[PDB]
Amino acid sequence: GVGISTGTFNNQTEFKFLENGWVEITANSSRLVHLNMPESENYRRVVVNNMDKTAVNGNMALDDIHAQIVTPWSLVDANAWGVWFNPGDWQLIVNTMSELHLVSFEQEIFNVVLKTVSETKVYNNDLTASLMVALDSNNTMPFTPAAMRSETLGFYPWKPTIPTPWRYYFQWDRTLIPSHTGTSGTPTNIYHGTDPDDVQFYTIENSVPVHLLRTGDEFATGTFFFDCKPCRLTHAPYYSFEASTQGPFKTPIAAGRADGNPRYAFGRQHGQKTTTTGETPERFTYIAHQLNNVPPVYPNGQIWDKEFDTDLKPRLHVNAPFVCQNNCPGQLFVKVAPNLTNEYDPDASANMSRIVTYSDFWWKGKLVFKAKLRQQMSINVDNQFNYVPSNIGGMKIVYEKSQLA
Amino acid sequence: GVGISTGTFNNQTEFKFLENGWVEITANSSRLVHLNMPESENYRRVVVNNMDKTAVNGNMALDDIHAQIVTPWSLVDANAWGVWFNPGDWQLIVNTMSELHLVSFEQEIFNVVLKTVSETKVYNNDLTASLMVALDSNNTMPFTPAAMRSETLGFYPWKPTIPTPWRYYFQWDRTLIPSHTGTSGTPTNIYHGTDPDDVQFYTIENSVPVHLLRTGDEFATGTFFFDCKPCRLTHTWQGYSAPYYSFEASTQGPFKTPIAAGRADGNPRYAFGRQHGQKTTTTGETPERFTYIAHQDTGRYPLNNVPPVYPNGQIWDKEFDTDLKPRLHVNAPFVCQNNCPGQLFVKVAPNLTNEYDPDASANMSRIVTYSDFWWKGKLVFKAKLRASHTWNPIQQMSINVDNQFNYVPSNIGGMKIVYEKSQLAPRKL
Amino acid sequence: GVGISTGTFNNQTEFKFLENGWVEITANSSRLVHLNMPESENYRRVVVNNMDKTAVNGNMALDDIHAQIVTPWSLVDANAWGVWFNPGDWQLIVNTMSELHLVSFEQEIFNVVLKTVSETKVYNNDLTASLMVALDSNNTMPFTPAAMRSETLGFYPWKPTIPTPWRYYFQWDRTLIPSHTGTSGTPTNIYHGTDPDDVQFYTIENSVPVHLLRTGDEFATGTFFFDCKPCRLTHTWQTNRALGLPPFLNSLPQSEGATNFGDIGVQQDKRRGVTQMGNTNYITEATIMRPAEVGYSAPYYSFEASTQGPFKTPIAAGRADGNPRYAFGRQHGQKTTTTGETPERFTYIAHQDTGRYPEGDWIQNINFNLPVTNDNVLLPTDPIGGKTGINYTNIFNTYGPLTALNNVPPVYPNGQIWDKEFDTDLKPRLHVNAPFVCQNNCPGQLFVKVAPNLTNEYDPDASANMSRIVTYSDFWWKGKLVFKAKLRASHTWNPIQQMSINVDNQFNYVPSNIGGMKIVYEKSQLAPRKLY
Amino acid sequence: GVGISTGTFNNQTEFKFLENGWVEITANSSRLVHLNMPESENYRRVVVNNMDKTAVNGNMALDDIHAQIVTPWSLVDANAWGVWFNPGDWQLIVNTMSELHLVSFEQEIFNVVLKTVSETKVYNNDLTASLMVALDSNNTMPFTPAAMRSETLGFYPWKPTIPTPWRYYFQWDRTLIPSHTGTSGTPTNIYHGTDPDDVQFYTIENSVPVHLLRTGDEFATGTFFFDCKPCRLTHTWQTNRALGLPPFLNSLPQSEGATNFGDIGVQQDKRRGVTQMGNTNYITEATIMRPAEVGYSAPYYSFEASTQGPFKTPIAAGRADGNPRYAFGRQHGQKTTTTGETPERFTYIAHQDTGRYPEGDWIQNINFNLPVTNDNVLLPTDPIGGKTGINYTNIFNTYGPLTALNNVPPVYPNGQIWDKEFDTDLKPRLHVNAPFVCQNNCPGQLFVKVAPNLTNEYDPDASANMSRIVTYSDFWWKGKLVFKAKLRASHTWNPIQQMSINVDNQFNYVPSNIGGMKIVYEKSQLAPRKLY
Fold first, then answer.
1. Nearest-by-Cβ selection for D212 from C111, C127, C158
2. Are B63 and B253 in contact (CB under 8 A)?
3. Torsion angle of alpha carbons B332, B336, B342, B343, nearest 10°?
4. Which domains does chain D carry?
5. C-alpha–C-alpha distance, residues C369 and D413, integer Å
6. CB C152 within 8 A of CB C76
7. Selected residues 452-491 of chain C with any CB under 8 Å from a CB in chain D
8. Rounded to 5 degrees, what angle do the CA atoms A305, A311, A316 make?
């Protein structure tokens, strides 16, 4: 019933030394996930357009036009290195391993809590409510990794996290004619529409089976198994763009030398010193010491990515060190179910009235690696106070290098 | 479920006699433990610096400068004699036993209650919330014995108790040069910092498995068996010397030299609160104190193991990790040779409001929550009955007209637990 | 879980019949027990002293000095007849059965409910809180029968009852030298304190395992089995004068009438017989040697003082003096619709005879000059020590090897069923408060307590008393007391006395028109029995 | 647990057809029963005494004098036809079936919901409270059928219903000497009290096991099996005059018409046959012997007195006198939208005849001079005792050995199904209140009561009533009542009378605009039966 705990928290990293110099690294991660109800229950097709900001000449790069489907579901995405390791185990990993294999992965949701709010405020339990959960075992919905927009789960184990609200790109048509400063006119810059052949409207309910979870039950994924090739730990015009119906896009660069090497911007969930004020994210440029695979990036580096469905297939992915050879883990989508009031009628155009409900549920992840034992990464006077908390409770995770030897 | 209890309260002390003059002494103990949520979840690195008191010349002994990690957890510690034995059982043990061993220790948390508070206050059961419990099985965390700070559980089975909030020493660099009162100059007094090489930052989440306990399920520690040497409940009437009141110093600051003997210099002086011996209905913040003047006469005017001190003294302690280990520990009679029983850490889980978002730098908004959970443990000893070698009788503890009323309550609920000596019998050296 | 009932209510009485005349009387009793939380969680050593009432000269008997350890626990005690039998069953037992054994006993608490109070008032279920239950099976703790204080459970299955807050005598030392009205000064009336070696501080927590019960669990004791001697539901009418062969009447009467008596045909000094007064020729029914003595005189209303203070001497058999007096409240027999604090009272005048009549006794000189002179005889009229109100019977004591007595009768509904034997080396021959006495061990006392339900502001290092959520519990109690009894036989031509409803006591056994019930005392030893 | 349902609502009637022309009618019934807590938890003894109304002369029949023991418990009674059947099912019974037996019966309470009210009004649940449920399987309690007060469960499946508060008769003595308007003084009219040898105070706690039901458990009464005689759904038209062989007719009619009668040829003083009136040669249809007497004349609107005051003499079969008059409320047939205190009423005019016509009766002298003079005949126009309004038929009784009766017909929807046979040594041949009579045991009555939900201010020693949390409970009752019925076969050429819907009675069997519903009365015995 309600009073039985359904799981156990686990955030230890286990290093099981095997025969012939191999080692199995089991990274357990566990977070307390907070989830508020959706803003609206209906899917919305919204087109953003910053024409007033980019109709001016000489800022072709500042283009934001994109059509996306706002989906009420929220995405639980642990695809980032910071979710699984603190600086101690990554220090051990970079210092003592040589190659690294991505082995297996599982998740589970446990100890679901659902609460309601009413007027001053009072918070009450709703034992009858439910949390809608869906796992995309067959990848019906599009693959949307949250590490790109920096919206994965928080890297700190002892603080809660929120899942990112889920959305995907609609397919549209756009043309923009570039120009330099002092150009003698306004180039063409319009939003055509959507090609009907490219219209695709995915929905979680039609696609994936949804498990309704009350306060006393669980959802658990199967142990999804990888077969990716290993990544070694031992170790192109500039000012260029291209364009299509998507609009302009900066060209890809295979390897490094606010340009060249990749720059990561991030917030307080994702390694920034938590207690600093302001909305400004803290940033780093990953100047690595260096086909050759891209290097991992503690903690905003994405771990895995999907192979493309195109006839062509690139030699390497710019954004992740590993790539799904044939299949990826299923994306986990969550949503607090509609808690309706008695005044609901569906034949009124007004949006439905709902009881203000929110959910707290614990997530546990397990991620297994296999690695072969081979500078020395170490603490020093300069970097010392980055790896311990402040007086008033702040903490940061400075980025670190994945290839030293 | 919610409506079914999970364990039984027990404070019985059981004497089971065995062959060859040995006695098994099973000391059960049970308490009701009140746990508030942490003041803040974030791990804090706090430095305290009493330079105002220490800078005055002659105040070297008042050095209270240190650095500590303030954990968002609390420790349930039962490493004190008073938790297990009432005065009558201690009288029986001291008066009839010559030697004493340890056998085992287990624990459990049962009947979790988890309540919330709303504004005039009104109290509501939140059946869904969880109590985090983590037992450091492998002794990964620093061992922080609670008896030295009088932080152990209460010694009265009827009064509820509280767990100590947990905190451990971070490393700090410090130096102080002494100066007597009347010295005109100001000595060196500086907090140097902390060595990078010696930094250690542990968290409960990454170090130990953490069980969640809703309001109808248990946690049970397996019976951890000791291997300690015998403790003698007799004193030799028939020693060593040391520098009196000499304060040595190191990277962390000054520290007094421990002495393996005593007269009142050298003898340990305890200070404790109302949970742990002081009369419960006396007002004021001052602690009750005594000095344990042992019978063994190991000291000399200006070796054998330390006495047991009832009710405030320790039972066991962890052996040092150094290659060369000391002859004895000044603070407990027994010492675990490879591992001590694991430390039990408890915490009320976060209970967030709808307003929460982590991109704000401020502390999280929460629903006020507190936990009442029953705790039970059993501590297994093994003792040998004495034999009357001498013609005369030995000294024995006894109620008498002076100490009579210490052992029974007052006209109101006042109770106190006075210390008794623990090696009354003499032994031939 | 929470919503499943965990037991049944049963207040039936079953009379199962066995071969050879025996009957098994299984008496089920069930109640709804209401328990408020303790006034304070701590143990208190309270000392009571009514020095002002006792300092007045002549009030030796009004002493109430004692020292009691007040305890947060409450005791669920069912040791009284009214808890088990209603008046109709008692009619059946006393009228039909002769002997009455005690076979077994068991208890169980079930369907625990537990609520909280908060301010107007709102009552909320507090499911996760606990009721704290203990059963002292080994009888390590002091025995405390609730029957003596009118503190047992209620005698109505349809009224909720309450448990008694438990308390036991701590040791004390006291001296109270007597006085009469208008004595020369103030006698010594001081409270010494407590001697150290008799101190005994008991607590539930250290002594017995305590079970924690939530809204959805039970506690049941085992079936205790007694070994008590039989109690007799008959009574003996024969004093010494009624034993043996009566004298041969040589001259029987020739007509009916109270005035026409029979006559013994031989002069008193010429009669034949056997007598113990060897220096006398007279043989009379007052002087003929009987086989033994039935009953015994005792110094009635004598007070003796051990170290704890004065107390009355118990008298084994009554006539007045000796006969017990029961005072009881509205749970236990007083009319429930009455106002005021005055208890309803009765004196149980037992039918059993074998008492003494102190105004009829006398002592005379050994020489035995039968028309006795004043100087050779001592009467109840004669003062002892010059006090006009005291005579020799107030100090006399005929207890000896020749004395024979009966056990005290049962007293429905307020009396006590069983009792524990003293732990002394030499034990008493009877108990004045119960017919059955456990020889080795008695039913274990059952203790109950509402567990601490703390508020967020708890701080055990502070000296102030703890703040608790106001909690209270209602739990159903059920018990099963099994008797074994023999049926009587019509030994004699005449009928015997039986209990019966008549026009006088009719309305004592049915409720009034506003719900007022009462239970009135019934005699227990109606039928006569041959002593010799 | 709390959230798992524990039964299924069912109100189907299933007609299973066996071989040899029998039908097993499985009557299921289900009702939501609402129950408030008792008004007062004590058993009360209340005397009703309307001396004001019966002291007016001539109001003797308005004697409402009685003592009863009002109890906290409430009774669930389903002993009425309307609870089990609807008009369509009743039609299929009475139009098709000849005999009806009673086979089985079982009950079950399920899905107990308990709620508490706190002052605006907010209705909170109380998952820990309990509902007491008792079953008198042994029939130890006083039997109390609720049909004779119209307090059975309601007859509509969708409406919720309430159980009757329970009460039973205590003993009393009364005398009421009758009088008429214009009498010279006040007759004796006094409540004598109660006699001790007849006192009987039953309590549910002491006499049956009582189960506690929390929200999540059931109580299932086992299947009770009847042994009652067949109730017949046919009626007997044959009076004494219709028995036997008719006379031979010589002059049969030759034309059709209202006045075209036949004639018996022989003179009345020359007919052949057998007659009882031996001194009379004349043979005729009022004279010819018949095998036995059908029906009996009884003294109508006669009253007799016993220790408990006056009462009416019942009559087995009515023609007015004897015909039962049913008064009933909105649960039990009256139009549910009606307002005000007035029961809907019907008088059940049975089809069966077997009655008497008092204005047609007469007695004449044994000589029997045929054109009887005035002084040789006692007509119903003749006074008895000089009273012009009271004739000989008012005091007449001709029950005898030759008297044949039919059992009382069923009455739909308010008629009682079964009744308990008297515990007397000599038992009545028929009961007038229900067709079936249980020879040894009827089904155990099912008593219900909300448990005491106390507050923290309770002490038993207070004279005032205990303070309770205002509680009420809703629980689902289910019942099955299995019959066994024989299908009729058409013996006659002609068609029989049948129940049928028509234009006049159309809107009695369907609801109104505002949801009102009514259940009108239906005739039970329709098809004629061959008596002889």
1. C111
2. yes
3. 20
4. 1-532 (2.170.30.10)
5. 99
6. no
7. 470, 472, 474, 476
8. 35
User: Which residues on C lie below 8 Å from D44 (Cβ)?
Assistant: 511-515
On whether the CB atoms of residues A81 and A299 are closer than 8 A, the answer is yes
Beta-bridged to residue B155, according to DSSP, are none
Of B69, B206, B356, the CB nearest to A12: B206
Query: Token digits for B11?
Result: 């404070």
Q: Is C279 helix (H, G, I), strand (E, B) or coil?
A: coil
Helix (H) or strand (E) holding D170: strand D164-170
Task: Report the run of H or E that residue D96 belongs to, with start and end.
Answer: helix D87-96
**Tokens 């055509």 belong to which residue?**
A192
Q: Which of D126, D123, D116, D111 is CA-nearest to residue D1?
A: D111
Task: State the structure-solving technique.
Answer: cryo-EM
**Max CA separation in chain C (angstroms):** 97
Give backbone dihedrals phi and psi of B418, rounded to 5 degrees, phi first: -85, 150
CA–CA separation, A132 and A37 (whole Å): 11
Q: Which candidate from D45, D128, D455 shows the least CB-CB separation from C511?
A: D45
Q: For residue C31, how many C-alpha atoms fall within 13 Å in the half-sphere facing its CB?
A: 25
Return the residue matching tokens 């009832």. B310
Contact (CB, 8 A) for A343 and A139: no
Query: Sign of the C-alpha dihedral, residues B113, B118, B123, B124?
Result: negative
**DSSP line for D195-219:** -GGG-----HHHHS-EEEE-TT--E
Q: Which amino acid is at C466?
A: M
- Report the gap between the CA of C3 and the closest CA in chain D (Å): 5
E strands, C420-470, are 445-450
Asked whether the beta carbons of D411 and D524 are under 8 A apart, the reply is yes
Q: What is the DSSP string of A142-200?
A: PP--TTTTT-S--S-TTS-B-PEEEEEE---EEEE----TT-SS---EEEEE--GGG--
What resolution in angstrom units was achieved for this structure?
3.0
Q: Contact D1/C5, CB-based, under 8 Å?
A: no
Which whole-number Å values give the CA distances from D524 to B407, D347, D409, D463, in the listed order? 88, 14, 7, 55
Q: Does D114 touch chain C (CB under 8 A)?
A: no
Please give, rounded to a whole number of angstroms, the shortest distance from the CA of C118 to a CA of chain D.
11
Q: Is B196 at the interface with chain A, CB within 8 A? A: yes
In angstroms, rounded to a whole number, what is the distance separating the alpha carbons of residues D198 and D307? Answer: 12
What secondary structure does DSSP assign to B223-244, as a single string? -EEP-PPPEESEEE-------T
- Sequential DSSP letters for B348-389: EPP-B-TT--TTSSSPPPB--EEEEEEEEEEEEEEEEE----
Whether residue B419 contacts residue B268, with contact meaning beta carbons closer than 8 Å, is answered with no
For residue C197, the SS3 value is helix
Q: Please name which of B373, B354, B374 lies closest in space to residue B364, comparing C-alpha atoms.
A: B354
Tokens coding D74: 């409430």
- A and B: number of Cβ contacts within 8 A: 151
Answer whether C199's CB lies under 8 Å from B403's CB. no
Contact assessment for residue A173 and residue A181, using Cβ atoms and an 8 Å cutoff: no
Q: How many CB atoms neighbour CB C312 within 10 A?
A: 11
Helix (H) or strand (E) holding A367: strand A357-373
**Facing B199 at nearest CB: one of A36, A274, A384:** A384
Tokens standing for B283? Answer: 């007002």
Q: Are B4 and C1 in contact (CB under 8 A)?
A: yes
Name the residue among D1, B115, A126, A127 with its Cα closest to residue C216: D1
| CA dist., res. D470 & res. D450, Å (int) | 10
Pairing of strands C22-36, C471-487: antiparallel
